[PDB]
A paper describes a structure:
Human Epidermal growth factor Receptor 4 ([name] or [name]) carries out essential functions in the development and maintenance of the cardiovascular and nervous systems. [name] activation is regulated by a diverse group of extracellular ligands including the neuregulin (NRG) family and [name] ([name]), which promote [name] homodimerization or heterodimerization with other HER receptors. Important cardiovascular functions of [name] are exerted via heterodimerization with its close homolog and orphan receptor, [name]. Here, we report cryo-EM structures of near full-length [name]/[name] heterodimers and full-length [name] homodimers bound to NRG1β and [name].
We used this set of interface mutations to enrich for the fraction of functional [name]-G778D-V956R/[name]-I712Q heterodimers in large-scale purification for structural studies. Focused data processing on the ectodomains resulted in reconstructions of the NRG1β- and [name]-bound [name]/[name] heterodimers at 3.3 Å and 4.3 Å resolution, respectively. We present here the first cryo-EM reconstructions of both the homodimer and heterodimer complexes of the [name] receptor in its full-length form, bound to two different high-affinity [name] cognate growth factors, NRG1β and [name]. This is also the first time that a [name] growth factor has been resolved bound to a HER receptor. Despite the diverse sequences of the NRG1β and [name] ligands, the larger-scale domain conformation of the [name]/[name] heterodimers stabilized by each ligand is identical with only small differences in the ligand binding pockets. Due to the lower resolution of the [name]/[name]/[name] complex, we cannot exclude the possibility of differences in side-chain arrangements between the two structures. However, we attribute the lower resolution to variability in data collection on GO grids, rather than differences in conformational heterogeneity of [name]/[name]/[name]. [name] and [name] dimerization arms are resolved in both NRG1β and [name]-bound [name]/[name] complexes. Extensive 3D variability and 3D classification analysis of the [name]/[name]/NRG1β and [name]/[name]/[name] datasets did not reveal any defined conformational heterogeneity within domains IV or dimerization arm regions. N-linked glycosylation is also resolved in the cryo-EM maps of the [name]/[name] heterodimers (NRG1β and [name] bound), with [name] glycosylation patterns being the same as seen in homodimers. However, in contrast to the [name] homodimers, we do not observe continuous density connecting the two heterodimer monomers indicating that glycan-mediated interfaces seen in [name] homodimers cannot be established in [name]/[name] heterodimers.
Residue numbers in the entry:
A (entry chain C): 64 to 111
B (entry chain A): 26 to 172, 175 to 179, 183 to 597, 604 to 634
C (entry chain B): 24 to 120, 135 to 602, 613 to 629
The structure:
Amino acid sequence: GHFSRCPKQYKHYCIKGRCRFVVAEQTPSCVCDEGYIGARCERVDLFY
Amino acid sequence: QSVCAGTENKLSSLSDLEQQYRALRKYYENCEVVMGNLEITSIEHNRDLSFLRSVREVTGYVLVALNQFRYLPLENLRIIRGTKLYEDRYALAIFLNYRKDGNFGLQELGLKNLTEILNGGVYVDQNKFLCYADTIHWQDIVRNPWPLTLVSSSGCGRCHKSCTGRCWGPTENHCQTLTRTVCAEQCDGRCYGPYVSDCCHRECAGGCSGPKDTDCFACMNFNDSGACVTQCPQTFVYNPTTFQLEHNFNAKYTYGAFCVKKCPHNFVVDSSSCVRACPSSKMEVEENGIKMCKPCTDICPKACDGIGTGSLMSAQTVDSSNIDKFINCTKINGNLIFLVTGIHGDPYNAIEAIDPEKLNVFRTVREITGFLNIQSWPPNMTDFSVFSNLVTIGGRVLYSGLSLLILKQQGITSLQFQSLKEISAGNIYITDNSNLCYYHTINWTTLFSTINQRIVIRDNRKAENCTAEGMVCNHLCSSDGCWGPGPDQCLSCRRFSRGRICIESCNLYDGEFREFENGSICVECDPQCEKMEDGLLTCHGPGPDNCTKCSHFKDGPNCVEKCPDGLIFKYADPDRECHPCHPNCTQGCNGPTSHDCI
Amino acid sequence: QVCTGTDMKLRLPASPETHLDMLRHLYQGCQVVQGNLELTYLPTNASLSFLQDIQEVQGYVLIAHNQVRQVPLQRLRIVRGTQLFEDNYALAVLDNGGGLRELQLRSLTEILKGGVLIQRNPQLCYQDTILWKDIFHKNNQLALTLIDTNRSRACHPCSPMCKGSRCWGESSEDCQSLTRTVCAGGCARCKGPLPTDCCHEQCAAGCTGPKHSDCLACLHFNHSGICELHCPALVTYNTDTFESMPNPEGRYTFGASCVTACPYNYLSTDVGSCTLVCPLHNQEVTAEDGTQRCEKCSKPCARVCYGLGMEHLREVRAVTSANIQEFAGCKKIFGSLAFLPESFDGDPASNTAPLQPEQLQVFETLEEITGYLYISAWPDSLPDLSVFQNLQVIRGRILHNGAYSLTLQGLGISWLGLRSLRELGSGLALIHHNTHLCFVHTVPWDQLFRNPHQALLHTANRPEDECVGEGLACHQLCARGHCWGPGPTQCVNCSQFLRGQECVEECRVLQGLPREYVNARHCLPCHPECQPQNGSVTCFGPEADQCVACAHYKDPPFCVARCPSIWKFPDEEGACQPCPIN
Ligand SMILES: *[C@@H]1O[C@H](CO)[C@@H](O[C@@H]2O[C@H](CO)[C@@H](O[C@@H]3O[C@H](CO[C@H]4O[C@H](CO)[C@@H](O)[C@H](O)[C@@H]4O)[C@@H](O)[C@H](O[C@H]4O[C@H](CO)[C@@H](O)[C@H](O)[C@@H]4O)[C@@H]3O)[C@H](O)[C@H]2NC(C)=O)[C@H](O)[C@H]1NC(C)=O
Ligand SMILES: *[C@@H]1O[C@H](CO)[C@@H](O[C@@H]2O[C@H](CO)[C@@H](O[C@@H]3O[C@H](CO)[C@@H](O)[C@H](O[C@H]4O[C@H](CO)[C@@H](O)[C@H](O)[C@@H]4O)[C@@H]3O)[C@H](O)[C@H]2NC(C)=O)[C@H](O)[C@H]1NC(C)=O
Ligand SMILES: *[C@@H]1O[C@H](CO)[C@@H](O[C@@H]2O[C@H](CO)[C@@H](O[C@@H]3O[C@H](CO[C@H]4O[C@H](CO)[C@@H](O)[C@H](O)[C@@H]4O)[C@@H](O)[C@H](O)[C@@H]3O)[C@H](O)[C@H]2NC(C)=O)[C@H](O)[C@H]1NC(C)=O
Ligand SMILES: *[C@@H]1O[C@H](CO)[C@@H](O[C@@H]2O[C@H](CO)[C@@H](O[C@@H]3O[C@H](CO)[C@@H](O)[C@H](O)[C@@H]3O)[C@H](O)[C@H]2NC(C)=O)[C@H](O)[C@H]1NC(C)=O
Ligand SMILES: *[C@@H]1O[C@H](CO)[C@@H](O[C@@H]2O[C@H](CO)[C@@H](O[C@@H]3O[C@H](CO)[C@@H](O)[C@H](O)[C@@H]3O)[C@H](O)[C@H]2NC(C)=O)[C@H](O)[C@H]1NC(C)=O
Ligand SMILES: *[C@@H]1O[C@H](CO)[C@@H](O[C@@H]2O[C@H](CO)[C@@H](O[C@@H]3O[C@H](CO)[C@@H](O)[C@H](O)[C@@H]3O)[C@H](O)[C@H]2NC(C)=O)[C@H](O)[C@H]1NC(C)=O
Ligand SMILES: *[C@@H]1O[C@H](CO)[C@@H](O[C@@H]2O[C@H](CO)[C@@H](O[C@@H]3O[C@H](CO)[C@@H](O)[C@H](O)[C@@H]3O)[C@H](O)[C@H]2NC(C)=O)[C@H](O)[C@H]1NC(C)=O
Ligand SMILES: *[C@@H]1O[C@H](CO)[C@@H](O[C@@H]2O[C@H](CO)[C@@H](O[C@@H]3O[C@H](CO)[C@@H](O)[C@H](O)[C@@H]3O)[C@H](O)[C@H]2NC(C)=O)[C@H](O)[C@H]1NC(C)=O
Ligand SMILES: *[C@@H]1O[C@H](CO)[C@@H](O[C@@H]2O[C@H](CO)[C@@H](O)[C@H](O)[C@H]2NC(C)=O)[C@H](O)[C@H]1NC(C)=O
Ligand SMILES: *[C@@H]1O[C@H](CO)[C@@H](O[C@@H]2O[C@H](CO)[C@@H](O)[C@H](O)[C@H]2NC(C)=O)[C@H](O)[C@H]1NC(C)=O
Ligand SMILES: *[C@@H]1O[C@H](CO)[C@@H](O)[C@H](O)[C@H]1NC(C)=O
Ligand SMILES: *[C@@H]1O[C@H](CO)[C@@H](O)[C@H](O)[C@H]1NC(C)=O
Ligand SMILES: *[C@@H]1O[C@H](CO)[C@@H](O)[C@H](O)[C@H]1NC(C)=O
């Protein structure tokens, strides 16, 4: 795909989610655990 | 006008792809105007996106990334205002929409009515299966050129032989119509043809149907009832013939993107505009139930920065570093939020956790102009001992539709707010509080400002379970507002109360202190007078003139323990009353006559 | 530069001898005329070259009863016509007859509003020639256009090279250039017959190019050389965050144009404009030296003392015994003052008495007039204007006959007085026929004026050498010879000291009379208890603390008349000590 493992400086980038690093745009992102939203998964989902 | 809010997630998404699609529908389905960003990401070729066809406008940026579907049904999107940009550079960004190890991805963009971007750049870059990414006159779309606009399928053909490199699709209905680069030399705006006679108005955006400020497919500045205008009708009009300022008869409030005849009740009316707070040079006042503001000629109270306002624009939460700014505050200008990162610190940043004792800086706050979002709290803070004197919240800024949001608070058993009487506007959402007992004892239509406000309660501690074998309401508290254990946690009591404390009876005829009473409130009387026995009232009101018996002399209408002699002298007898002294009594007095002077 | 007009229609000049000097000072070097432009009763061979600079007139243009052959207005491009002659006309040429020969309005290209009219000019050729409908404005079309071809001179064809025979005069350069009726497009003005010759929506009078920066005249407001709909507001409203904040680009609106700040005599308002009147529920506040602004009242505003031309006094002729009491104890008057024949005489028709010298005392507290002071009658028992001796500032916001802030006509004055006056904010000063005043020549007029286009005009006042020929002249102690009148009390500025109102040579420190302490220009007695010794601190100062020497009963911090009864008594040195008996 377009992403791989997060570099060491991102060990704590994401909270309550799975950290991934996008290679094509050289940019970190996270896949949030159920019920969490936000760029770092730092908030709960009001529609859940 | 079908206004909806954006998701604001950037590249991040949910682990469940089906919920991610259902959420995309829940946010944008049948919407026309998007507040903040329009984010369309990670949707598979097996899911329909036709519910996005009604979107006309976006205030933030439009982001499309990492999808697998062939076509974007964004045909009615006319204008992107660019009030927030992707990576602080781009207003439109469409990239990586394909599978690396397959034949799926975005092929056509749609956008037949997309005419302009007011701010920010354009990002396209890599899109393996996307036709017509190039051959677009982006200078007719961008209002502020930057001599950004990065483009990288090929051999897809042309829209039509008649469309001279002005194409984003395979047919004559995909041809770019130029409105800025094909105009008369005299035009300040955009045109509906290549002549000085078919150019349109200066405030109009996104193309035009005629030369009038009414005839326009979008507006810059304000909407005045269908006219695009630089400014709403003002309370005065300047007369350049006489150098005089004359009063207007058709003036309106400048309010958000609009001109209106009736300002929102919760907002400050300044003289011709409606605002979330008055500027620091003026003092907020109220007259005849109207919230307004006047020049700061007196010693003026100041409100403190909330989360997302003032010096805290970059803050998501109260945290161990910005909590120190709330120490002497009685009013917060902006929102009050506690996220996981604020409370338990953020190891990605230099921010630490908050010590529960540091929360005491908020014990002096009575008003919060924004919303209360509480998603984390320290493990042993079982009630809101901080904010117990909070009087009112919200009215001007809401979180989606909410003014009070409480999610998943496991350490909480009671709320215990004593002074919180009213919510200015917005709904309430309280769920997953598995140990919270007193949440069902509140009559919420007593706290709401209007009959249109609602509350949702689910998944908290079972009310019947707690009532039977847990905690119950105080015998002296009414059915409306029993927030916790004891007579001091009740908002409305039967019989009597003294400030925050509810009581069965008052000290009118007994106790080392005596009171007078009204229908439910009792207050102490002047102690210099005598205490009555045998069930008899000691005082009719707050003073020596009300006391029903006096152990000392009087002075006119009231009981006095010590007479103000030596003023001029004015002696007193011990049994009845104070009396003026003989005119010669300048150095002591024993009475009213000539031999009484010392 | 910027200049104003008289708005007097066809009335006779108040002082014909100064009529050309008035016009030369008001107009020489200005580009824009605010209000009406009136050029009337000019003598044969008048030197009018100072008018060649006028480009734009806000009111009407009136040329009447002149004996001049030509008037140099060839640069005049636009008339706004916001005021109309007889409520009808933006241009009027009347009775100029040996008289006006040619109009010579080469560059005239716009009438926005109101008619043209021409009548009874026997020497004026080519009335008939101009195509007025090209000069008119499309959206108004108010071309009343009454004309009078009954001239006594024979007209020559206007030019061998003017295809339409439409001209401003007898020269080949007088041919009218058309700017509306000759072009293919629907534009109100254009630079040529082609569809690409349209210049802009906001431009007027034609153009040098297709942009709002190219306009030869401009609708709405000129901002800084570009033509614009409104001047940018001082405060901008944020539509996304719902808050109001100062505008980094914010500007003041000023008549025809948009500016960073307003002129000295204009009152700033927070809405983004400058006015001559303060909006309702606002105070005039001198927040910084040299300026003034309006500020909102937090509670109901205090009584405003109005003068003539304002509120209930708008239709009042002059101050009379029926209205003099309205000014009793006022320090600032909102409006003007006028003292005319039938102010100090009677008016039996309305049962109104004449003003008396005692009634004039209502102005003793007056410091500022927000208008003009016009006096054409005064009592013979008053040799001066001492009833206004405390007047400090005349603003000139309202001018007599549109030009004068201070006017004195034929009074029985022997000297001006008014020693408190220090500023004439705006407007001209006219002093004439005043048969016994003379100190007008010693007044420091150059210290009172505040703007260019501002001057004294005078005639028929008693001649200086005939009057100072009696030794009636300014006092030697003061002000390099500048005085308001006779003696050391009529001085402008004392070279040594001022005692009360009198300039004095000596500060009376060590003389036989009650001894005085020194001040930067003043002199004042010791406190009565301070002993009049010959030493310069002993007796002397503004406070008890300087009076170290005591005449009797010295209390250690200060000399007192008696030792206070704790009881005190005088000791062997005359100082107060505590008594053995209290
Ligand atoms: C709001 O922000 C302020 C800063 O602006 C913070 O700082 C001060 O905090 C103190 C304590 O809360 C405030 O109250 C007073 O503190 C005194 C402490 O002693 C010092 O100051 C005195 C001043 O005279 C000096 O003499 C002394 O040497 C010390 O340097 C107390 O003395 C005061 O009360 C006691 O003394 C008086 C004496 O007359 C008695 O009458 C009282 O009964 C009592 O015994 C008083 O408590 C102080 O005013 C703040 N200073 C300023 C400049 O504002 C605050 O802490 C912060 N508030 C909160 C709620 O966090
Ligand atoms: C997206 O693009 C389309 C064009 O590609 C653009 O056009 C709109 O089309 C609809 C119908 O398809 C127009 O709807 C109008 O409906 C009213 C009644 O509800 C009719 O009376 C109108 O008839 C006439 O007048 C219109 C003048 O606005 C003409 O457009 C029309 O041809 C008729 O002569 C008409 O059917 C709609 O008005 C137009 N848009 C406009 C304002 O011209 C559509 O607006 C684009 N969507 C966006 C982004 O707004
Ligand atoms: C002692 O207790 C009294 C009650 O037992 C207190 O009440 C009374 O207070 C009023 C006002 O100070 C005193 O004066 C007169 O009251 C009458 C009644 O009008 C009342 O209602 C109108 C309408 O709302 C209101 O405006 C008034 O303020 C009153 O509340 C007036 O008509 C008179 O003009 C005048 O104000 C009463 O005399 C007084 N009652 C007693 C003591 O007789 C009283 O204030 C308490 N005293 C103290 C120490 O506060
Ligand atoms: C300026 O503001 C006015 C309102 O003051 C706008 O007019 C209104 O625009 C809304 C847009 O949603 C129209 O609502 C639509 O109504 C139809 C009804 O059939 C519905 O099917 C749509 O879903 C939608 O809700 C509304 O009718 C319209 N009102 C009128 C009288 O035209 C106007 O569009 C604004 N102009 C600009 C340029 O923003
Ligand atoms: C919960 O609070 C609501 C108010 O938010 C209470 O409803 C209100 O009840 C009062 C008292 O009955 C109503 O006022 C008057 O009631 C009489 C009948 O008792 C009627 O004749 C009058 O015309 C008048 O309606 C009031 O209208 C009503 N408010 C609403 C919005 O319906 C409610 O009683 C509270 N519940 C408890 C258990 O305390
Ligand atoms: C017994 O009842 C009387 C009223 O009949 C109580 O006095 C009243 O107290 C209220 C506040 O609870 C006062 O209301 C507000 O007062 C401020 C004063 O600045 C004013 O700005 C507000 O507009 C509003 O009026 C009310 O004025 C006051 N009434 C009088 C006549 O003074 C009294 O406190 C009660 N006693 C007990 C023991 O509860
Ligand atoms: C907007 O108003 C400005 C003035 O505020 C107009 O610009 C002015 O144009 C005049 C000529 O029409 C300039 O005067 C001339 O300057 C040269 C300098 O060498 C001199 O040789 C001439 O004798 C004459 O004095 C004047 O300097 C100029 N002012 C500025 C500030 O540049 C402008 O034309 C107006 N725009 C519109 C659209 O009406
Ligand atoms: C007339 O009015 C002026 C102000 O308009 C008076 O003020 C100033 O006074 C001083 C003293 O006479 C003049 O001279 C300077 O004095 C200082 C004293 O310490 C000395 O250090 C300097 O070397 C110089 O001699 C000053 O020039 C003058 N300023 C102005 C603006 O003229 C003046 O006293 C009045 N004169 C008369 C003749 O009444
Ligand atoms: C120009 O002079 C002519 C006469 O030479 C005036 O026209 C006459 O006006 C009178 C007005 O009472 C009529 O009775 C005549 O019938 C007119 N004569 C003709 C031949 O039509 C004219 O009024 C003068 N123009 C102006 C503007 O005063
Ligand atoms: C200080 O002033 C005093 C007057 O206040 C002078 O004293 C007087 O001197 C004359 C000399 O002929 C005597 O006749 C008076 O009787 C004195 N008056 C008093 C009150 O004693 C004294 O000379 C002055 N000193 C100086 C140095 O001039
Ligand atoms: C209460 O939580 C705080 C959080 O900082 C912690 O330091 C403390 O140990 C906790 N107390 C108990 C009794 O667990
Ligand atoms: C109340 O809640 C507790 C939770 O452990 C449960 O065990 C108990 O059976 C409940 N009691 C009643 C009366 O439902
Ligand atoms: C005007 O100047 C001419 C020049 O020839 C002269 O004849 C005439 O007398 C002058 N008029 C006046 C009033 O001086």
